[PDB]
Amino acid sequence: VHGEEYAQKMQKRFHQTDIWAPFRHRYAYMYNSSNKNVKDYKQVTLSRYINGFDKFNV
């Protein structure tokens, strides 16, 4: 809506286009840079006691 040249100027990040450096707010460190809990805090505190929270990857 603000001009075709404006959009490509705003969506442009790197002069060189042969390097992939995706945007990240932060970088993970724990668990060899991974996530152990991929659930909400309520699911975090309830899945340890209550059944029906884990979908049983088989």
Partner 1 sequence: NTAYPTPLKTILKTTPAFVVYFVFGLGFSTVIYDVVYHPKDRIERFYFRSSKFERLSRKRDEKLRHYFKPAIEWQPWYNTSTNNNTRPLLRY
Ligand X SMILES: CCCCCCCCCCCCCCCCCC(=O)OC[C@H](COP(=O)([O-])OCC(O)COP(=O)([O-])OC[C@@H](COC(=O)CCCCCCCCCCCCCCCCC)OC(=O)CCCCCCCCCCCCCCCCC)OC(=O)CCCCCCCCCCCCCCCCC
Ligand Y SMILES: CCCCCCCCCCCCCCCCCC(=O)OC[C@H](COP(=O)([O-])OCC[N+](C)(C)C)OC(=O)CCCCCCCCCCCCCCCCC
Residues of this chain that interact with ligand Y (CB under 6 A) are 50-52
Identity of the amino acid at 35: N
10 Å Cβ neighbour count for 22? 5
Cβ 3 vs Cβ 11: under 8 Å: no
Q: Is 41 in the site for ligand X (CB under 6 A)?
A: yes
Site for partner 1 in 1-58 (CB under 8 A): 24-26, 28, 31-32, 34-36, 38-41, 47-57
Identity of the amino acid at 56: F
Residues at the site binding partner 1, with contacts judged by CB under 8 A = 24-26, 28, 31-32, 34-36, 38-41, 47-57
